[PDB]
């Protein structure tokens, strides 16, 4: 609002407010379980011991070797498939990214323009009303002075 | 959205408050410089003419003349229970001026309570002993229990739940125990609001511990007074409150919890206890003055010798029920 | 910012300089007159066209005043007369005579009382039917402008001396003067409530005074510069707004001046072809009327 | 900082002196971003003196910066009008810069006072040299509308 | 010991309600005034 | 959008509230005019001898 | 690009009639299964309210290491934890915002009480000034 | 005619395999890839049988 105030007045009013306050007075079940678990971080653990490459041993060595072979074949297929097309998909992702970026920034600037317009209309209205009440209180003070001087002058 | 709207309304109202207080005080200085150059209830007229109605000395033993309390039964005002210093709770009837019931237990009793069934009563002693001793049976059936004196006694409307406060910042509840060690401020004044949803308890340092009865957590502190405040009592009509200190009598309002009336007295004059009929009020101490509570020295009775320990209003408000520490019982 | 069809409207008419144009008290009508010895009636809203002419006056209309009833018009003529024109029928009601010179100004009362001054150094108050001057006040130098208080006992007359005379009709005691001006007072206008007087003088200063029985000395409130008067010694008017917070004036420097009653210039708008004789504000909306000695009258906001 | 000016005569390329005067170039950069300069006449052309333009009304007055009315200029000694092509701003008072600007065509050592210098035209100087030869009426105003079609910042 | 969080954050954009406006509030009126006047020409 | 909606609500509240302030100012203005009218009638009864 | 419910990128986006917003089929279907209505508008909605529109689809570029393998199970656990932690942050944000709202509302009500009281004191003070003037 | 109401209020994601619907799509893609491999090899097994 239109006024010339120091922050000390604001702090005094806030202290009065604090004094008067003192005087007056979906979620599921699995998610809940894991949440009560990991509320203290408790990072859940799963086996990553498929790179240790256990030396010749029991059937576990055979199982690890076979699963690693199958993982390797799938990895081959996926990476060659990735390099069949190159980075055209990446270029399209970046282009759609800049499209959405620009679409957002347009509406952002529209919104700040609207906010500035609301601000200016508000500031105009406050200016006219505040000028009116300023002249009002000035003429009130002059009227008080006139009344008291008249009353003493009648004697 | 709601939080931001509320915060900004707070800021706007804060600016309103700021300007408001500012030129209000401006105009207050301006003015200061400008002026420089129930039909059955007893009426005020009949109550103001109150004087001595009885002279009882046989009620209390003169070997140890001292009293610290006085309790009256709501259903029968003839029964008066002044706490005696002979470690005996004496129940007396005004009609016969005789000790109808005597309960004997080694310390001077400090507080007593009376029920509405003419049979249930409790008492407190300096030996950290609080017992709900029926007057009809004249014997203690329950025990309330320490290493320091108890500062206040309270009870639930059911009459069996018991709350006590001591000077060690520990309170006894007859299924919880909440202890505050951050303040460690002793208390001297407390009472139970007839609504029963909350209560207040004045402290020695001047702060007031206002707590909800069901929750049992303090939510308000009122510290505008100095020295130990002797007593505080809530009214009955709902919006009449009274407080006293070791040097004026003041009236408060339950909703605002702020001063609404002040009766100034000299420093050496200290009030002791106050009584409420929100129609009329009674006070005791060095300067005895009774004033109308509804309409805010109107009464001056000095027939009570020694220091008057308590004052009560009897039925029909025709006379009072006051006791002193000189083993005397004068009815106003 | 009003109900006018156009923000600015030029009014064409008359055959010579127009000397006065005054709003109806209702704010719905207004009339104009000047050196052509004619009175034109207008419509404020709509097509803004003439609905009547008031012929018969044998002289220039130095001043005219609407009636509170908004049914009769009083016109002051340069030929030492004061005619009463029925607006709704246009016939001669009465002609008040008794002056001895050009009747400069005219004013009406809240009660059918008319007042006027003329170059014969006299002021005359007229009843609307008496046809004769019931009271006459004689001065030493010719009087130029009048203002009657709506309450009905004080009249302020400004003339050559440069000092406003306040006359109490009943008291006839005149030992109270609003000194402060130094030249010819062209026009006077009373505030709507009756507390403040607007004065314009040939000493180039438009001043404002307070109209109260009691004062704290130096009754002069404030003065405004800028409004200058030419060498033709015209009678330039001043006006009081409907809210009495904007004071208006005309100047011979082709300028219409509006002040904020606080000493701050608000409008400086030019637009006239000659000296602007009269200025007025609408009693309801924010319209300002202009009247210049160039056969034209301007509309306002 | 770089702005391309698709003027009606040709192409004007400008680099803004952010390092020298930062405040006076940020408004220009964001103003080219908004691009309300589309369809704005080069209202003033004086042979070998200036080409001024940049006002929405086209009457040689007005134009709102991001600050809205006016801002404070920043000048330092090494800035000078020693050449032909320096892009500067326009003002009508002590500190009264508005949205319009101009391009120098000659050394103006007398004009390096209250006037801020904030650009150097790296390409399209030929366009300004021909702008110096534009049909002009009695006032320094081209007869035909010397609009700027559109401006990218880059 | 005061509630700095409840006051500083509260007056963070509360001052901006009077400060951010003053920048663009001197923009539209200038151009509108010039357009209104010069659209009516020097005469 | 936060501050836009907040500005909308504060605009609505201010447009609601200011008429009350203006009306109160007018009411107190009317009273102060009445009291000054009485004061000036009293001084006018004084002035009748002038 | 982002479904209005979770922010997910809808490979098959839909738009509604009462309030056209980008939504994903499965989530609105499960909402209808829970409550046969739209909480966005508090109005009845049917399966036909969505219209299958044509989109170029959002290309999904793979990270340096996503080729089956335990990389995929590590990502399983990581996104489990990430969405769950988002849930915790958002729930505690609920609790903090509601408690702060209650505190602010109490302070606002007290402010209303004190502005009324102070306004009354203004009225008596103004009247006292005016009545001194006699 | 339906204009665009893209802005909304909710928090988007990267359009990649790092979201759980997307990641689960890659899960089922891995599964159907090894499934297709099993299909072809079982055709070859029955022909060889």
UniProtKB/Swiss-Prot annotation, chain C:
Entries under SMART domains matching the protein: WD40
Source species, domain of life: Eukaryota
Ranges of the WD repeats in the UniProt entry: 13-52, 56-95, 98-136, 138-177, 180-219, 230-269, 271-301
Tagged with keyword Repeat: yes
GO biological process, one term: mRNA cis splicing, via spliceosome
Main location: nucleus
GO cellular component: catalytic step 2 spliceosome; nucleus; post-mRNA release spliceosomal complex; spliceosomal complex; U5 snRNP
Protein name in the entry: Pre-mRNA-splicing factor cwf17
Lineage, uppermost ranks: Eukaryota, Fungi, Dikarya, Ascomycota, Taphrinomycotina
Name of the gene this protein is made from: cwf17
Curated annotation (Swiss-Prot), chain D:
SUPFAM superfamilies xrefs: Cyclophilin-like
UniProt-listed Enzyme Commission number(s): 5.2.1.8
Residue ranges annotated for the PPIase cyclophilin-type domain, each copy included: 1-153
Pfam families to which the protein is assigned, alphabetical: Pro_isomerase (PF00160)
MF (Gene Ontology): peptidyl-prolyl cis-trans isomerase activity
InterPro entries from the UniProt entry: Cyclophilin-like_dom_sf, Cyclophilin-type_PPIase, Cyclophilin-type_PPIase_CS, Cyclophilin-type_PPIase_dom, Cyclophilin_A-like
Keywords: Isomerase, Rotamase
Catalytic function, reaction form: [protein]-peptidylproline (omega=180) = [protein]-peptidylproline (omega=0)
BP GO terms, sorted: mRNA cis splicing, via spliceosome; mRNA splicing, via spliceosome; protein folding
Organism superkingdom: Eukaryota
GO cellular component, one term: spliceosomal complex
Primary enzyme class: isomerase
Function recorded in the entry: PPIases accelerate the folding of proteins. It catalyzes the cis-trans isomerization of proline imidic peptide bonds in oligopeptides.
Subunit structure: Interacts with cwf13/snw1.
Family under the similarity heading: Belongs to the cyclophilin-type PPIase family. PPIL1 subfamily.
Name of the featured protein: Peptidyl-prolyl cis-trans isomerase ppi1
Source species of the chain: Schizosaccharomyces pombe (strain 972 / ATCC 24843) (Fission yeast)
UniProtKB/Swiss-Prot annotation, chain E:
Subcellular location: Nucleus
Region (Disordered): 1-15
Assembly with partners or alone: Belongs to the 40S cdc5-associated complex (or cwf complex), a spliceosome sub-complex reminiscent of a late-stage spliceosome composed of the U2, U5 and U6 snRNAs and at least brr2, cdc5, cwf2/prp3, cwf3/syf1, cwf4/syf3, cwf5/ecm2, spp42/cwf6, cwf7/spf27, cwf8, cwf9, cwf10, cwf11, cwf12, prp45/cwf13, cwf14, cwf15, cwf16, cwf17, cwf18, cwf19, cwf20, cwf21, cwf22, cwf23, cwf24, cwf25, cwf26, cyp7/cwf27, cwf28, cwf29/ist3, lea1, msl1, prp5/cwf1, prp10, prp12/sap130, prp17, prp22, sap61, sap62, sap114, sap145, slu7, smb1, smd1, smd3, smf1, smg1 and syf2.
Role according to the record: Functions in the second step of pre-mRNA splicing. Involved in splicing intron which are longer than 200 nucleotides.
Name of the protein in its database record: Pre-mRNA-processing factor 17
Organism this protein belongs to: Schizosaccharomyces pombe (strain 972 / ATCC 24843) (Fission yeast)
Chain's gene name: prp17
Residues of the full protein shown: 9 to 51 of 558
UniProtKB/Swiss-Prot annotation, chain H:
Highest taxon of the lineage: Eukaryota
Location(s) in or outside the cell: Nucleus
Family named by the database record: Belongs to the WD repeat PRP19 family.
Subunit structure: Homotetramer. Component of the NTC complex (or PRP19-associated complex), composed of at least CEF1, CLF1, ISY1, NTC20, SNT309, SYF1, SYF2, and PRP19.
Role noted for this protein: Probable ubiquitin-protein ligase involved in pre-mRNA splicing. May also function in DNA repair.
Name of protein: Pre-mRNA-processing factor 19
Residues represented out of the complete protein: 50 to 98 of 488
């Amino acid at each position: 609002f239109e006024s010339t105030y120091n922050e000390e007045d604001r702090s005094a009013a806030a202290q009065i407010v604090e004094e008067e306050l003192k005087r007056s007075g979906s979620d599921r079940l699995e998610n809940a379980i894991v949440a009560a678990g990991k509320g203290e971080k408790l990072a859940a653990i799963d086996v990553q011991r498929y790179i240790q490459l256990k030396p010749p041993g029991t059937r576990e060595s055979l199982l690890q070797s076979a699963v690693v072979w199958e993982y390797q074949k799938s990895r081959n297929d996926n990476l060659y498939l990735l390099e069949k097309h190159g980075e055209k998909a990446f270029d399209s992702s970046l282009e759609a990214l800049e499209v959405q970026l620009e679409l957002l920034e347009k509406e952002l600037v529209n919104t700040k323009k609207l906010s500035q317009g609301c601000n200016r209309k508000r500031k105009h209205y406050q200016m006219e009303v505040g000028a009116r009440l300023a002249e009002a209180e000035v003429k009130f003070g002059q009227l008080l002075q006139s009344s008291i001087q008249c009353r003493v002058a009648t004697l | 959205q709601e939080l931001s709207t509320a915060l900004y309304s707070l800021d706007a109202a804060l600016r309103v408050i700021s300007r408001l207080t500012k030129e209000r005080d401006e105009a207050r200085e301006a003015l200061a410089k400008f002026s420089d150059n129930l039909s059955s209830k007893r009426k005020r007229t009949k109550l103001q003419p109150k004087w001595a109605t009885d002279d009882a000395v046989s009620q209390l033993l003169q070997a140890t003349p001292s009293t610290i309390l006085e309790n009256l039964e709501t259903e029968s005002t003839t029964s008066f229970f002044p706490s005696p210093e002979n470690s005996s709770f004496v129940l007396c009837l005004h009609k016969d001026e005789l000790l109808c019931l005597d309960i004997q237990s080694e310390g001077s009793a400090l507080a007593c309570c009376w029920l509405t069934s003419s049979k249930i009563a409790v008492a407190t002693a300096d030996a950290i002993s609080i017992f709900e001793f029926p007057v009809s049976s004249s014997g203690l059936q329950s025990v309330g229990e320490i290493d320091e004196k108890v500062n206040f006694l309270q009870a639930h409307p059911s009459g069996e739940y018991l709350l006590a406060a001591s000077n060690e910042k520990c309170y006894i509840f007859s299924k919880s125990q909440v202890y505050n060690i951050t303040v460690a401020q002793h208390i001297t004044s407390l009472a139970v609001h007839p609504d029963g949803n909350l209560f207040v308890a004045g402290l020695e340092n001047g702060e007031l511990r206002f707590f909800e009865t069901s929750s049992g957590n303090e939510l308000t502190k009122f510290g505008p007074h100095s020295s130990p405040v002797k007593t505080l009592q809530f009214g009955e009509n709902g919006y009449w409150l009274v407080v006293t200190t070791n040097s004026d009598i003041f009236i408060w309002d339950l909703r605002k919890s702020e001063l609404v009336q002040k009766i100034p007295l000299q420093t050496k004059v200290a009030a002791v206890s106050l009584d409420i009929t929100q129609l009329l009020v009674s006070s005791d101490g060095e300067t005895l003055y009774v004033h109308i509570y509804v309409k805010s020295r109107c009464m001056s009775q000095t027939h009570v010798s020694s220091i008057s320990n308590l004052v009560w209003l009897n039925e029909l408000h025709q006379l009072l029920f006051s006791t002193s520490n000189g083993a005397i019982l004068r009815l106003g | 910012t009003s109900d006018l069809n156009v923000p600015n409207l030029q009014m064409f008419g008359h055959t010579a300089e127009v000397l006065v144009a005054r709003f109806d008290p209702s704010g719905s009508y207004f009339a104009s007159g000047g050196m052509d010895r004619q009175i034109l009636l207008w419509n404020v809203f709509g097509d803004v066209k003439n609905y009547g002419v008031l012929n018969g006056c044998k002289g220039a209309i130095t001043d005219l005043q609407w009636s509170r009833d908004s049914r009769v018009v009083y016109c002051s003529s340069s030929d030492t007369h004061l005619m009463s024109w029925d607006a709704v029928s246009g016939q001669k009601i009465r002609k008040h005579k008794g002056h001895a010179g050009v009747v400069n100004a005219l004013d009406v009362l809240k009660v059918e009382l008319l007042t006027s001054v003329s170059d014969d150094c006299t002021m005359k108050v007229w009843d609307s039917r008496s046809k004769d001057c019931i009271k006459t006040i004689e001065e030493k130098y010719p009087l130029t402008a009048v203002a009657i208080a709506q309450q009905g006992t004080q009249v302020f007359i400004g003339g050559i001396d440069g000092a406003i005379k306040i006359w109490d009709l009943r008291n006839n005691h005149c030992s109270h003067v609003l000194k402060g001006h130094k030249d010819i007072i062209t026009s006077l206008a009373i505030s709507k409530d009756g507390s403040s007087l607007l004065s314009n003088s040939m000493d180039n200063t438009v001043r404002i005074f307070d109209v109260k029985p009691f004062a704290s000395a130096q009754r002069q409130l404030q003065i405004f510069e800028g409004a200058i008067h030419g060498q033709e010694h015209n009678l330039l008017g001043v006006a009081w707004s409907r809210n009495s917070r904007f004071v208006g004036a005309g100047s011979s420097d082709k300028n219409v001046y509006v002040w904020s009653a606080t000493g701050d210039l608000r409008y400086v708008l030019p637009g006239h072809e000659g000296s602007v004789n009269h200025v007025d504000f609408h009693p309801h909306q924010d319209i300002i009327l202009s009247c210049s000695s160039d056969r034209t009258i301007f509309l306002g906001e | 900082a770089n702005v391309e000016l698709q003027t009606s005569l040709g192409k004007i390329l400008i680099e803004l002196y952010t390092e020298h005067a930062p405040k006076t170039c940020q408004n220009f950069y964001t103003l080219a971003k908004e691009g309300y300069y589309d369809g704005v006449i080069f209202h003033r052309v004086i042979p070998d003196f200036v080409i001024q333009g940049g006002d929405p009304t086209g009457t040689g007055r007005g134009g709102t910066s991001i600050y809205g009315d006016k801002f404070d200029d920043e000048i330092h000694s090494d800035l000078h009008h020693t050449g032909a092509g320096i892009l500067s701003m326009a003002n009508a008072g002590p500190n009264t810069n508005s949205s319009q600007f101009f391009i120098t065509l000659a050394p103006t050592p007398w004009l390096d006072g209250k006037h801020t210098i904030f650009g150097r035209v790296v390409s399209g100087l030929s366009v300004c040299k021909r702008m110096g030869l534009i049909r002009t009426d009695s006032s320094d105003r081209p007869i035909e509308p010397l609009k700027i079609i559109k401006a990218v910042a880059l | 010991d005061s509630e700095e969080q409840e006051n500083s954050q509260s007056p963070n954009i509360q001052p901006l309600l009077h400060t951010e406006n003053l920048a663009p509030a001197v923009v539209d009126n200038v151009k509108d005034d010039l357009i209104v006047s010069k659209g009516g020409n020097s005469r | 959008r936060k501050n836009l909606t907040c500005y909308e609500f504060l605009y609505n509240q201010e447009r609601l509230a200011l008429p009350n302030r203006l009306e109160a100012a007018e009411i107190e203005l009317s009273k102060m005019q009445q009291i000054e009218a009485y004061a000036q009638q009293d001084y006018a009864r004084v002035t009748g001898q002038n | 690009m982002f479904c209005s419910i979770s922010g997910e990128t809808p490979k098959e986006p839909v738009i509604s009639r009462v309030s056209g917003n980008v939504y994903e089929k499965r989530l609105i279907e499960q909402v209808i299964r829970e409550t046969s209505k739209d909480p966005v508008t508090q109005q009845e909605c049917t399966l036909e309210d969505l219209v299958p529109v044509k989109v170029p689809d959002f290309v999904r570029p793979r990270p340096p290491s996503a080729t089956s393998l335990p990389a995929l199970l590590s990502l399983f656990q990581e996104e489990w934890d990430s969405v769950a932690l988002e849930q915790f942050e958002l729930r505690r944000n609920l609790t903090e915002t509601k408690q702060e709202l209650s505190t602010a509302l109490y302070s606002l009500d007290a402010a209303l009480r004190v502005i009324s009281r102070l306004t009354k004191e203004r009225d008596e003070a103004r009247e006292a000034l005016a009545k001194f003037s006699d």
